[PDB]
Amino acid sequence: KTVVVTTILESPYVMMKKNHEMLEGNERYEGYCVDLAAEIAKHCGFKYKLTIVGDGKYGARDADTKIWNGMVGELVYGKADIAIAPLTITLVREEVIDFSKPFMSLGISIMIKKGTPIESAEDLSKQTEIAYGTLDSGSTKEFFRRSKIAVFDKMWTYMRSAEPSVFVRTTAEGVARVRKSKGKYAYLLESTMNEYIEQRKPCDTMKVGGNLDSKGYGIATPKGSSLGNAVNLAVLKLNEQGLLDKLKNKWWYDKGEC
Amino acid sequence: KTVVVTTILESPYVMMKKNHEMLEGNERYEGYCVDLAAEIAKHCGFKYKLTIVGDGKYGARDADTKIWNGMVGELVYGKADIAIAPLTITLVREEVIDFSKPFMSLGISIMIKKGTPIESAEDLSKQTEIAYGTLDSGSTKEFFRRSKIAVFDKMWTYMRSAEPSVFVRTTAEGVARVRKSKGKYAYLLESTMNEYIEQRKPCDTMKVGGNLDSKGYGIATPKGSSLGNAVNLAVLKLNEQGLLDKLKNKWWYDKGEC
Ligand SMILES: CC(C)(C)c1snc([O-])c1C[C@H]([NH3+])C(=O)O
Numbered sequence A, B: 001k002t003v004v005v006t007t008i009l010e011s012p013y014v015m016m017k018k019n020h021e022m023l024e025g026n027e028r029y030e031g032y033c034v035d036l037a038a039e040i041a042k043h044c045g046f047k048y049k050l051t052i053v054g055d056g057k058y059g060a061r062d063a064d065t066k067i068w069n070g071m072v073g074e075l076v077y078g079k080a081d082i083a084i085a086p087l088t089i090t091l092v093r094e095e096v097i098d099f100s101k102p103f104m105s106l107g108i109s110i111m112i113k114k115g116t117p118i119e120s121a122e123d124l125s126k127q128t129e130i131a132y133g134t135l136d137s138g139s140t141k142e143f144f145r146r147s148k149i150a151v152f153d154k155m156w157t158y159m160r161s162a163e164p165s166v167f168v169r170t171t172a173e174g175v176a177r178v179r180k181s182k183g184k185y186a187y188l189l190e191s192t193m194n195e196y197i198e199q200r201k202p203c204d205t206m207k208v209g210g211n212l213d214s215k216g217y218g219i220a221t222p223k224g225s226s227l228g229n230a231v232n233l234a235v236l237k238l239n240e241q242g243l244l245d246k247l248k249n250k251w252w253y254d255k256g257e258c
């Protein structure tokens, strides 16, 4: 009866509080999605337990074993009742799980270290001196892998063949790579995360150019779950009340460092 | 030609240095195994690259897919040339990878919060008020799962059926659980790690009683790797020179906090 929430450690959506070893249950975490989960639970009238996804993945269907991993897999195989995280709504996932209307809009974007002579995806695709990649798993990588758009196909061809690998395991690694590469590495990630990092010291990164696409994050539930309807209505209510905007401002700008 | 070393983040064997985002390659890590790897490389005359195992696992053969995971899998499938970590030498693993003679001896042991009325495995097995478990994966769990020793069989029966789960994902979680349980949780882990934690503030934990078994950690290489022989001779030389003891004292006691 206690709703099991699967989420993922991804600043500023879900983070461990300072000296968390001394805290219990949900009180161990904080962030945009922690606040969102509380608001949704409050609106839908249920108790919940926040759990961090085991493999630390968002969700992808293995070609080899066909087994969904990450938060999507947790829902598909009945391990969790709802996923509250920066989980991108995609066609492939929509076929196996349900998504509420978007609680946040974003698009793939380019992160560069300030000073890098790049302002668009076309620019990256037309040169080789500045390397570029994405999270080694996730919707961003999948977008490039499945895209037939000329520029993105060219970018994907390069990325999947680049050696050393241009892919990273976490956002933190992607950021560190941009920073330590002296402008020789550009990172492709979702816009709202790009905007978040822009506000983190040493304030040496920036989002450049427009977004490569447009999509959103949604609250996910198992396909056909009765919880889906109510959660979707809560997201809409929260959006209309301005709560969603308040949360972004709180975690992105109020706590900004630049 | 550069030896790929697979290891795992497990204090004090391998740890991220303070403000590591600003460091490159092997310089990002420190610890007992980082030092050991350097000594072995120096003795065998090769260059190497330290890499953290992807799934953060030691190594187990999935029953379902039969696919080895963790550092053992990295060696089995040819992703790494050598594993330098607190990898326990077991019969099952010895059948698929090679191990040098032990570079460290240890045994499964009991970790309790000071004050807990427990001094042995028999004591734990004869009561229910104090819960107890192990790493959710690894040689310790496997020992209990495969054991036919009366006391350990009884302990395993309890552990695999206990609800909530008595298993943890990491040593850190096992320790935090012992500490936050007010003596209501005992943790089963290898002795040298138990001894390490004993030296960490708040100095509220302790190893109690004798060990449940006797074994060791070995440097692992792919089955039949030419690198195995030389690495084994290096471990023996390093042991005879007192280097192995120096490293333990350095990371356990010299840096002790109790
Ligand atoms: C970690 C973060 C959410 C910022 C990013 S950046 N590029 C991605 O593919 C992702 C993961 C994606 N949203 C997903 O749900 O798979």
Ligand SMILES: CC(C)(C)c1snc([O-])c1C[C@H]([NH3+])C(=O)O
Pocket (backbone or CB within 6 Å): B010, B058, B059, B086, B087, B088, B135, B137, B138, B139, B140, B141, B171, B188, B189, B190, B193
């Ligand atoms: C993490 C640490 C090495 C202390 C422990 S404690 N109990 C275990 O099973 C392990 C893992 C084990 N050595 C292995 O190689 O699987």
